[PDB]
Specification:
Jelly Rolls; mainly beta; binds a molecule of 4 linked components (XYP-XYP-AHR-XYP); 1 helix; Tachylectin-2, Chain A; hydrolase; eight-stranded antiparallel sheet
């Protein structure tokens, strides 16, 4: 396939950093209070991406990341725009991110990637907390320079550059205000580069432009001068704001590409790719289509690229086998590890024991989530719910700050299917605004039905950002082994607001309104494109 179409991945992976090691491209994204945090995706062509690891296996940023006492928890805090690079000299990946005023470094060995055309064996990833720096590198962009000195560009509304110690664990020096926009416009989203002898920093003007800065002195400390890379460019997707932020990366053939993202709410922020050309005077420019738009299709960045993949694809059936989750799953806040187990053996399965007593889904620990692929997808959870106890509520949630679910309520000796809507957080502070209402009752389910209940969410995430239209999701259940599905409840209208940042997700939850002791088994999950 000699060309590709935008977007390259229709899944919420915001604040991307991209770089190349040998034959492999790596992409790092932001995850807020979702745990594990800071996913890493891998590609051979900048187009087909597979998740391979997460840089922060459990969030270590403070006790609120364990959701100890309900809303506002650490909702919409945690990992904002951060940065990742691979250091050849010690075969180590470095992830830095500022969270609530301190900067955290997590590192992993690379399994000798520099020597194996950039491949990291799946077993070699092993991320550990390596340092904390007592300066906030808001919207950090790491550069490992050609002489092995490490720098971080950061800031909002103006850009600073810090020099780190040789081991990357301490700040040695900061130059403040290496760039300020001359008309007082806010910039942020720094990514930092050393390209053919010169220093570049990419910054965004939220949320519609990207500037390229270049050091006027040839020093990493600048000062820097700017040119526009994109400003309010049209395409390649409608109703998804503007392509901005992101970063630039070289393919093995020496050609450069700009990987930006779109505000494709209600789905989230998704990556788009364009080629770059370099001017004779040493600046990069986006290659547009014949109409000056970010093109819907372009030549493939790598020809005859490897197609091999690690682990389960986004749409692959996941029966929760083995000892670890696939790279697609993330908990809402850190999980209580004493309250879930992956069963292993022939069948696998995930046991979710109730971990929180609450009437409020947003206060519940151990809600397991994953990204919805767009523009439309069905997510199906298969459960055994015989272990539910009085007051337990479990099910499949369309999860965000305006949420709905289809699930099972156990009251006394009755288990029944319900559809619940009007679950809402207040965008001003993220306290609960509504704990929901039963919008429809489904049937009472007997023990045989309880042993195999299938819960289905059909979500439409077709972009609607900036429009007056809200997309809708519908909910279904099966109590005949997935052979027949029955619709339950109204169509649920989804928010287009950007304030929660993360897109809508599919999730499975289990909590109690009375007491702990109950459990469900999640036998499987499947996402189908619809
Ligand atoms: O378009 C959705 C996302 O917005 C960008 O993120 C920043 C955001 O930008 C506003 C988006 O809507 C515009 O109409 C408006 O004019 C933009 O300002 O809001 C600002 C910012 O968060 C702030 O960052 C600095 C920090 O110190 C503040 O506490 C924090 O509120 C946010 O990053 C993003 O580009 C796009 O995806």
């Amino acid at each position: 396939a000699s060309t590709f179409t935008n977007p390259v991945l229709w899944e919420d992976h915001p604040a991307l950093e991209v770089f190349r090691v040998g034959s492999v491209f790596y992409y790092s994204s932001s995850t807020f209070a979702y745990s594990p945090g800071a996913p890493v995706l891998k590609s051979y062509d900048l187009v087909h991406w597979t998740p391979v690891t997460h840089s922060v296996p459990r969030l270590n940023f403070g006790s609120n990341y364990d959701l100890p006492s309900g809303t506002p928890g650490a909702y919409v805090k945690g990992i904002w725009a951060s940065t990742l690079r691979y250091r050849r000299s010690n075969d180590r990946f470095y992830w830095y991110g500022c969270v609530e005023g301190r900067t955290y470094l997590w590192t992993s060995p690379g399994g000798n990637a520099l020597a194996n055309n950039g491949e990291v064996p799946p077993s070699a990833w092993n991320w550990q907390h390596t340092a904390t720096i007592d300066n906030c590198y808001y919207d950090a962009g790491l550069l490992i320079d050609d002489d092995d000195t490490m720098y971080i560009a950061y800031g909002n509304p103006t850009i600073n550059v810090a020099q780190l110690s040789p081991d990357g664990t301490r700040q040695v020096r900061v130059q403040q205000r290496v760039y300020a926009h001359p008309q007082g416009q806010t910039v942020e989203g720094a990514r930092m580069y050393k390209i053919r002898g010169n220093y570049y920093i990419l910054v965004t003007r939220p949320a519609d432009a990207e500037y390229v800065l270049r050091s006027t002195t040839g020093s990493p400390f600048g000062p820097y001068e700017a040119r526009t890379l994109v400003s309010r460019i049209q395409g390649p997707l409608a109703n998804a704001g503007f392509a901005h932020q992101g970063g630039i990366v070289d393919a093995p053939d020496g050609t450069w590409h700009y990987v930006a993202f779109m505000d494709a709410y209600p789905g989230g922020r998704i990556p788009v790719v364009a080629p770059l050309r370099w001017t004779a005077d040493g600046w990069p420019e986006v290659v547009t289509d014949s109409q000056g738009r970010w093109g819907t299709s372009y030549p493939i960045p790598v020809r005859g690229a490897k197609n091999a993949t690690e682990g389960l694809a986004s749409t692959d059936l996941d029966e929760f086998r083995g000892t670890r989750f696939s790279e697609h799953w993330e908990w809402n806040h850190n999980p209580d590890t004493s309250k879930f187990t992956l069963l292993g053996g022939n069948e696998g399965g995930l046991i979710l024991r109730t971990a929180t007593v609450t009437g409020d889904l947003f206060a519940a620990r151990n809600t397991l989530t994953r990204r919805i692929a767009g523009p439309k997808a069905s997510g199906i959870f298969r459960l055994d719910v015989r272990g539910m106890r009085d007051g337990d509520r479990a099910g499949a949630v369309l999860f965000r700050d305006r949420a709905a679910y289809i699930g099972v309520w156990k009251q006394g000796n009755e288990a029944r299917i319900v559809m619940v809507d009007d679950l809402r957080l207040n965008e001003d502070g993220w306290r609960t605004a509504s704990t929901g209402r039963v919008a429809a009752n489904g049937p009472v389910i007997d023990t045989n039905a309880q042993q195999d209940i299938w819960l289905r969410i059909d979500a439409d995430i077709t972009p609607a950002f900036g429009t007056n239209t809200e997309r809708t999701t519908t909910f279904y259940y099966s109590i005949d082994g997935g052979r027949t599905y029955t619709r339950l409840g109204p169509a649920f209208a989804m928010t287009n607001s950007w304030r929660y940042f993360t897109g809508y997700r599919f999730g499975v939850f289990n909590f109690s309104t009375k007491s702990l002791g109950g459990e469900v088994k999640v036998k499987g999950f499947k996402m189908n494109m619809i």
